[PDB]
Amino acid sequence: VVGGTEAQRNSWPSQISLQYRSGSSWAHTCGGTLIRQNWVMTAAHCVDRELTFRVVVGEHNLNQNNGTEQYVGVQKIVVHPYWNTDDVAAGYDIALLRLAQSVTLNSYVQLGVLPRAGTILANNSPCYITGWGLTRTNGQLAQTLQQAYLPTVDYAICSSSSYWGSTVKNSMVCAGGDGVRSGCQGDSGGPLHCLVNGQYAVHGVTSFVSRLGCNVTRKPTVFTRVSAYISWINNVIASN
Ligand code: NA
């Protein structure tokens, strides 16, 4: 997250860190959302590589023990069957991870609330992105979880020529684009949290930013629209 602030430790308890095994070590690579005690929602592109992945729930500081972390292996990966890694602009950038164990819920670990199917946010709706991604273009991962206020940019503006044009689809949500605040690498797969009727729900799965940079004016961060995928998610969980 570029232009973020440090989140409080219990603000976003559905946020997870997706990590891969790297020699003797684990490395953060992506965000996700805990949506069942044994299921995580992330981006398909996050699991393109044939790696050993684990999920950390209750994480805050990636390089310090917080005393609240639970570490759980990924046992099964279900990628959206229409996802194409060499065509992120087509969409379908979504994947479900079944965990080897069910995690325990507490003030640091909770299920994300998903919007109702078909829900479309009005332009300029209030949302926050969260994650441990780069804090500058071509920078480095955050140590502690960051958040940034990213209001939505509706499809008619986002698919306009000076924004993303044909690259953005209605199966996506755009947010931000102010040139200062943005998602960045390492935030991919995590949540976009939007306040509706008093309650935060996870409306987006972070998918992509501009090849020119993370915080580019009129290139808002682009998210998979969760409310396009409610039946897909339910079908996968029901079948696994
Ligand atoms: Na930690």
Instruction: Write down the catalytic residue from 93, 182, 210, 227.
Output: 93
208 Cα: distance to centroid of ligand 1 (angstroms)? 26
Q: Is 173 exposed, middle or buried (0-12, 13-18, 19+ CB in 10 A)?
A: buried
Is 93 an annotated catalytic residue? yes
Q: How far from 203 is each of 94, 129, 151, 213, CA to CA, in Å?
A: 13, 10, 12, 23
69 is in an annotated binding site: yes
137 Cα: distance to centroid of ligand 1 (angstroms)? 24
Residue 29: both structure tokens together? 């690579």
144 Cα: distance to centroid of ligand 1 (angstroms)? 8
Where does 1-12+112-227 sit in CATH, by number? 2.40.10.10
HSE toward the beta carbon, residue 153, CA cutoff 13 A: 25
Q: Which residue has the tokens 């309650």?
A: 199
Is 154 an annotated catalytic residue? no
Fold of 13-111+228-240: Thrombin, subunit H (2.40.10)
6 is in an annotated binding site: no
CA distance 137 to 125: 25
19 Cα: distance to centroid of ligand 1 (angstroms)? 13
Instruction: Write down the catalytic residue from 28, 45, 60, 193.
Output: 45
Cite the DSSP H helix spans in 78-181.
155-158
66 is in an annotated binding site: no
Give me the residue spans of the domains in the chain: 1-12+112-227, 13-111+228-240
Strand locations in 139-220, DSSP E? 146-149, 152-153, 172-175, 191-196, 199-208
For residue 65, how many other CB atoms are within 10 A of its CB? 7
Nearby residues of 224 by Cβ (< 8 Å), 6 or more positions away? 43, 91, 92, 93, 94, 171, 172, 173, 204, 205, 207
Nearest in space to 70 (alpha carbons), one of 60, 61, 53, 58: 58
Experimentally determined by: X-ray
31 Cα: distance to centroid of ligand 1 (angstroms)? 14
CATH topology match: 1-12+112-227 vs 13-111+228-240: yes
Resolution (A): 1.6
215 is in an annotated binding site: no
For residues 173 and 86, is the Cβ–Cβ distance under 8 A? no
CA distance 191 to 32: 6
Instruction: Write down the catalytic residue from 188, 207, 210, 227.
Output: 188
CA distance 19 to 28: 4
66 Cα: distance to centroid of ligand 1 (angstroms)? 5
